[PDB]
Design a protein around this ligand. Structure first.
Ligand SMILES: NS(=O)(=O)c1ccc(NC(=O)CN2C(=O)NC3(CCCCC3)C2=O)cc1
Ligand SMILES: [Zn+2]
Length: 258
């Protein structure tokens, strides 16, 4: 794996090592708000993060992941388009070099400054590695970030980034409550898609919240001081780690709201 986000290893190159990059259910996509249709078959969405147990934060050279204890049903996502129980394993973000870009999904071609992905796996498949081989293996809850007021619940994340500046660095990150990253409304769009990085597996039910959260310019400037490189290597700022919108093909985006 030498994929990344540069001119020579970025999204336009991924197909050569990951041919599913040109597949029939790739993510992200543009959400055309006028074409998305309210779906009365959707059950109420249930985000149950009361017992979430965060463990560690890791710079993986592509983003940073806040990882959770997923050895039992502690933080789960259920309902909406989902059949059964999906366990939270990690969250991460995608962001830009400037405030007008960074999200992976777009809304009527609008790009947000960043996008939060809370990744969950379907417990009927027993472990994450089995779940990613299944068309309904994962559920990713996507939340847009706009630059405005600070998000108080983000600042514990922002303040540890200095300790994980480079690829392969991790830090203990216990007792973080991901409920502080949610907007007030759980109105959402949903469609079948993929992981947005290699290996681009078509295993994700995407649930993208309509209401962005606001973060401050200072908060997102701290994301942009991270590094794609390892320690001791030439500094390459971790910015623009987003895949652009992919063809919708034979898919419909469903809305939870009238
Ligand atoms: N942007 S995204 O679509 O939300 C998205 C994109 C890529 C990924 N990639 C992965 O999770 C890659 N990956 C595996 O396959 N296995 C582990 C998790 C389980 C333990 C072993 C390591 C892992 O980290 C996740 C979400
Ligand atoms: Zn992601």
């Amino acid at each position: 794996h030498h994929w990344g986000y540069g001119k020579h290893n970025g999204p336009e190159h991924w197909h050569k090592d990951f041919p599913i990059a040109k597949g029939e259910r790739q993510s992200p996509v543009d959400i055309d708000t006028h074409t998305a249709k309210y779906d009365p078959s959707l059950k109420p969405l249930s985000v149950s993060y009361d017992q979430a147990t965060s463990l560690r934060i890791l710079n993986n050279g592509h983003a940073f992941n806040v990882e959770f204890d997923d050895s039992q049903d502690k933080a789960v996502l259920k309902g909406g388009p989902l059949d059964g129980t999906y366990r939270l394993i990690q969250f991460h973000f995608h962001w830009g070099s400037l405030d007008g870009q960074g999200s992976e999904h777009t809304v009527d071609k609008k790009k947000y400054a960043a996008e939060l992905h809370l990744v969950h796996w379907n417990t009927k498949y027993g472990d994450f590695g089995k779940a990613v081989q299944q068309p309904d293996g994962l559920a990713v809850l996507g939340i847009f970030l706009k630059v405005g007021s600070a998000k108080p619940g983000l600042q514990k994340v922002v303040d540890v980034l200095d300790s994980i500046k480079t690829k392969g660095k991790s830090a203990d990150f216990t007792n973080f409550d991901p409920r502080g990253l949610l907007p007030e409304s759980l109105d959402y769009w949903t469609y079948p898609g993929s992981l947005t990085t290699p290996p681009l597996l078509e295993c994700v039910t995407w649930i993208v919240l309509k209401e962005p959260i606001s973060v401050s310019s200072e908060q997102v400037l701290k994301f942009r001081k991270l590094n794609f490189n390892g320690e001791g290597e030439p500094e390459e700022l971790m910015v623009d780690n987003w895949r652009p919108a992919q063809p919708l093909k034979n898919r419909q985006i469903k809305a939870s709201f009238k």
